[PDB]
Amino acid sequence: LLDLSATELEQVLYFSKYIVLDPKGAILNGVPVEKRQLLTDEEYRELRYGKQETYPLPPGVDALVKDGEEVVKGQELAPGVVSRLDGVALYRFASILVVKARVYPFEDDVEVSTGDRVAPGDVLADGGKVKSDVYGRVEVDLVRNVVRVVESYDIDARMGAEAIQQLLKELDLEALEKELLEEMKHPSRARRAKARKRLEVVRAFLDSGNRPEWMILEAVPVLPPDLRPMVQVDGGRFATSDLNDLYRRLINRNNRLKKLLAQGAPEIIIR
């Protein structure tokens, strides 16, 4: 129904972690903005901020780059260090980080804030004189009084069953049905066969009424007590229908989840 890798990617996102949002990852990634594809957050980070490539500087060794010096992909940030992607190499006390971005020195007040993602033409500083002609996040470094628009433009993130149910709610069926009608009646079998394969469930839902918005599970009813009986065998031992053995674990699961959401967000832990 969701035009998905129903077998692999489905559980891939349900259990492993993958950012997904439809609106716009407008900024480039080797391929232009993606619309609904799922990504690994490593590349979504590297994108998130242009391209920062930080390399240590040997102690007592001064770098061959300047603090606000443009460093290209492969340039030696130091006698031994070699950059790996273009941008501006900034100093660290100790190291050099070349962040893929376009630089705009400011001698007046800065107009963009480090963090804001600015379009080509948008003012970065000094009013209209310091402007951003590059999409992406901005770093206003007073270290050399510049505003660097990294190419990293506004690309957000989503994950897991919540995004799953969102896409669920994010879909209106008759649109898909008309599209699938096109995809069968016009096209050849190879693809239109699967088009109708999904169109059949689409018909089931549409003519059936009830929304799939509850297609997933969030309020699990709890069996009536005797239905999973606990019978006293003898002398104190208890024979319990295994449902409770799982109910208990579920409760513990949910409980610690609540605790950590109240306590702290170790994202690896949380996942």
Binding site: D156, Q263, G264, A265, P266, I269
Partner: protein, 361 residues
Amino acid sequence: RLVKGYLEISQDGYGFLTENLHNLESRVAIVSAGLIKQYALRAGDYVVGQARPPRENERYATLLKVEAVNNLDPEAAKNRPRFDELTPQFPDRQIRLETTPDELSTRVIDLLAPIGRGQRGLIVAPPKAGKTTLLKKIANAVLKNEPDIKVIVLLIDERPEEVTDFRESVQGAEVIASTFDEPPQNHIRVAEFVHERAKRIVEEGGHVMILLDSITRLARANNLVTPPTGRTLSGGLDSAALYFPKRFLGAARNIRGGGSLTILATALVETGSRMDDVIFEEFKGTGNMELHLSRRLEERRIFPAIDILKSGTRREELLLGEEVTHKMWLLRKVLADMDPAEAMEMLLARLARTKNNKEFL
């Protein structure tokens, strides 16, 4: 953007920086376990460092960089002897007590129970016996005699007015308080937090005092918190609850490597419950200072209502000179035979005349 606090390490290897309220606060700063590992940092250590506003989906700001740990550069944090490894010894350096509004109280303390640095002390009195007022006097006298030492006042399960009066009367010294309106969990949490901060300070060779009102109420919280332990001590005390107060008080010690933790705390007795008396006798074997106040002396409005005969230190010779030691020995010999109230009234009369050195003269 700069942030500061005292480290609370979570079970998960990351920590938070707290405020003076010593509780989880919205403004606490996250600290990654990585940083803790570089700086070998510990709970209660005071951390100052530049921070950044939390990113999207972050509920707490993140310390971008560590600037100072315990008011010093982080390097020494990696290389330093560990508090529990510090040598526990006697207080070998006296602190003279003098406070202008009542020099007589500090006076009788010095002539009965002198205070060294690293002191594991206790004052024992029934309710309404100058105990809390006496602690106020010691606080002020410390803040006049030993301004260099980090003076910390702790108020547990006690009266709110006392809290405020000490906030105004402590003149800005770090006081952490938790009135009786708070549950024992709050009390135990705050007490352990301040405890660990103090141990971290002394780890750097610093001098600290904990003025702990109501150590017995803290023991009450420990009893209420200890989950079972099985058997119960006579008087209603739990056996394993008192392990924590015993360790807590035993923390006070003299260090041969610099700094020391002194803890002076207020004890309740003659309260009609075996529980208070058992706590008293249990702490008495760990402490080096007992100073007894008599309820009958308070009833006569004779202050300070100190029970001279029961009061004393342990190892006066390490804290007093031969002349002072023999002066006080002569004094006590004179004073063993007299009755409590009479002894105090006469002592106040003799001491109201002149300085104590001039009193000896």
